[PDB]
């Protein structure tokens, strides 16, 4: 079991033991890491524990090598020599190793608990192998935080689709949505056995936890629930494959008389051909996700994989391809588990079609000829590393905007992450500028662009529309109730219910609220399609009913508000909560 040191890529055999990911480390770097922090456990081809019959000494500064085993200070044979000596912990390839100085950064990456604001800015301006290691340890920390959630136990079964749950005392309740799957148990005497993978949702009336299940078992009183935790796969591929400006287009053959719609995008298509990876940045609704379909129709012999981190972003791409691209030579990939329903009009799960569509986590190991990664703001360096490990291709086009809302980063609570730290590509668009840029709002009415080009994008947007007189925003305080952690606001659903009998054309509008639970609970009063702001990024709607639930730091986030209000194609109703933001936009009063 030999490997490569993370921060100098020398050959080595050690692995730090207190770090969650066990990064391979060369000898000098391992001494630097175990002499400064408190990570004192090291594993070679065998661990560095004391091989006494009974002894617990693991601190590598203490152990000695004797015979063919490592003994502590009080069991060493007189033919022995210290490991942690001379500035080098002894491992294989000891004298062919190059020291480094980044051990003042690798310590901070491997030591921190990822809660402060600075750890993400350090996980994104380091070297590439440290970017991969930092992303991997962040994924591992987010996974082992899920073990800190409570444990459920059934009190009674009110109905076959209505359980009743009591949570463990002193441990926080998990949020109840289809992200978090639980496993059942009947552990009494008598069968400490999993009885199915379930998932919950808080039913409207009573303390009923309406559960969906894989199996068809009857649930007793004693059945109890434990959250599942997914092991983090280690990652290898670089975040950004190195750029190589070509002289002339390779692998792509352009087209004769593409269309009259994508005629103004031809120069950017030639630029995509010339480079290796290119980055596109535009304010919302300005042709970014349209540009990818135009890339499809400008290089018709080019096999393309479209990818995004959500499912509604890739579904917006799927709809645009349904409108434009030929539907026989297209596809769509859905994972087997699939707690959420996806777009089903393409020949699902046929990766050999010329135009594949996928979420970045569920990609299959394949090739392409140009791969389009839409919505890079919602991507972490784990996601870009996964898309660089699976998909091997000739050109990469990263499309997205940093001013929309990022990956959530559940651990981050103290501070704010500027756009140039969201991942590597968003840093590239905020360091040197994007390779391709298109700002002109071709989707939203000019009222929406007039109020959204003053909040984030400082007066840089003009619309190919006019004031469409269907942009209403009202100010109603909305006395809130509290769910698990995602608040629910009854009286604002009430005023929306009033705005549904008294405006008939709007019954096709889509509900948008920053909280998942209110998005579930306003379907049973209204019946409209419902979408959360975080998962609404990239798909537009004819009419949008937005409801600011609470006055907080989350729902009064201007990026979240911007991606909320720039999805209405022709009409929007915005039930606000904050006074200043309600004064910041310029709608009708209502």
């Amino acid at each position: 079991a030999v490997g490569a040191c993370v921060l100098c890529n020398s050959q080595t055999s050690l692995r730090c033991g207190a770090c969650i990911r066990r990064p391979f480390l060369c000898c000098k770097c391992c001494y630097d890491h175990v002499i400064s922090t408190s990570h004192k456990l090291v594993l070679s081809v065998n661990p560095y524990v004391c091989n006494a019959p009974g002894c617990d000494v693991t601190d590598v500064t203490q152990l000695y090598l004797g015979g063919m085993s490592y003994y502590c200070k009080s069991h060493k044979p007189p033919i022995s020599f210290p490991l942690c000596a001379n500035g080098q912990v002894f491992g294989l390839y000891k004298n062919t190793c190059v020291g480094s100085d980044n051990v003042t950064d690798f310590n901070a990456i491997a030591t921190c608990d990822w809660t402060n604001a600075g750890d993400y800015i350090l996980a994104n301006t380091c070297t590439e192998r440290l970017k991969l290691f930092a992303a991997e340890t962040l994924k591992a920390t987010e996974e082992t935080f899920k073990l800190s959630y409570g444990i459920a136990t059934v009190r009674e079964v009110l109905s076959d689709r209505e359980l009743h749950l009591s949570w463990e005392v002193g441990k926080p309740r998990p949020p109840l949505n289809r992200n978090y799957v639980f496993t059942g148990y009947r552990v009494t005497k008598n069968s400490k056995v999993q009885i199915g993978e379930y998932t919950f949702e808080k039913g409207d009336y009573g303390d009923a936890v309406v559960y969906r299940g894989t199996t068809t078992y009857k649930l007793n009183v004693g059945d109890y629930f434990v959250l599942t935790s997914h092991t983090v796969m280690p990652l290898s591929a670089p975040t950004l494959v190195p750029q190589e400006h070509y002289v002339r287009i390779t692998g792509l053959y352009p087209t004769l008389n593409i269309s009259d719609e994508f005629s103004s995008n031809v120069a950017n298509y030639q630029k995509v051909g010339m480079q290796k990876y290119s980055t596109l940045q535009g304010p919302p609704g300005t042709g970014k996700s349209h540009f990818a379909i135009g890339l499809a129709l400008y290089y018709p012999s080019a096999r393309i994989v479209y990818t995004a981190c959500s499912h509604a972003a890739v579904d917006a791409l799927c709809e645009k391809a349904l409108k434009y691209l030929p539907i026989d030579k297209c596809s769509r990939i859905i994972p087997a588990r699939a707690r959420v329903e996806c777009f089903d009009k393409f020949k699902v799960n046929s990766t050999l079609e010329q135009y594949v569509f996928c979420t970045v986590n569920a990609l299959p190991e394949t090739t392409a000829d140009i791969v389009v990664f839409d919505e890079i703001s919602m991507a972490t360096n784990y996601d870009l590393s996964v898309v660089n490990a699976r998909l091997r291709a000739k050109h990469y086009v990263y499309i997205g905007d940093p001013a929309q809302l990022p990956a959530p980063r559940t651990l981050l609570t103290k501070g704010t992450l500027e756009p140039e730290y969201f991942n590597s590509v968003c840093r590239l668009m905020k360091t040197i500028g994007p390779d391709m840029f298109l700002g002109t709002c071709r989707r939203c009415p000019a009222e929406i662009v007039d109020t959204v080009s003053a909040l984030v994008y400082d007066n840089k947007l003009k619309a190919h529309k006019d004031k469409s007189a269907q942009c209403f925003k009202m100010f109603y305080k909305g006395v809130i109730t509290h769910d698990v952690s995602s608040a629910i606001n009854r009286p604002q659903i009430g005023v929306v219910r009033e705005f549904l009998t008294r405006n008939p054309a709007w019954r096709k509008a889509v509900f948008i609220s920053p909280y998942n639970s209110q998005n579930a609970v306003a379907s049973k009063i209204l019946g409209l399609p419902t979408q959360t702001v975080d998962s609404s990024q990239g798909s537009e709607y004819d009419y949008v009913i937005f409801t600011q639930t609470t006055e907080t730091a989350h729902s009064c986030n201007v990026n979240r508000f911007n991606v909320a209000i720039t999805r209405a194609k022709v009409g929007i109703l915005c039930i606000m909560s904050d006074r200043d933001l309600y004064d910041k936009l310029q709608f009708t009063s209502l």
Binding site: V2, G67, M68, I79, R248, Y253, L256, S301
Partner: protein
Amino acid sequence: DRDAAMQRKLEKMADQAMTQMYKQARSEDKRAKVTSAMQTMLFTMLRKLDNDALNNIINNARDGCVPLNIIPLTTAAKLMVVIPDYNTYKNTCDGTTFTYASALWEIQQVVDADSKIVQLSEISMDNSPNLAWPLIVTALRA
């Protein structure tokens, strides 16, 4: 001498452990990277030969001008090579002769990616954006 015998037995077992661990590590490493090592070895050997036909077909295959079948040896047999861009056409073709693999070939027929036949007078510095690349040239050995 009893203790020195114990030391000799221990160092002999250490020596066998070193040898067996090295053999296992090197053998599994060699059997892992077998595809890439063989391809790198092949192209090292191909550059070492310095033949003027192998160099020509490799320097064409870098640009994108690869043959679609096995290159023939017989006089007056058929070879179909794809030419991706006009400049690659200009480097290899002249009039109707076609200089490939250090041999002269007589062009018979140039088709497009839409499988329409094309005359060699359409292939111009100016009309080429109106073509449908990559051409497939069917030629015969001189």
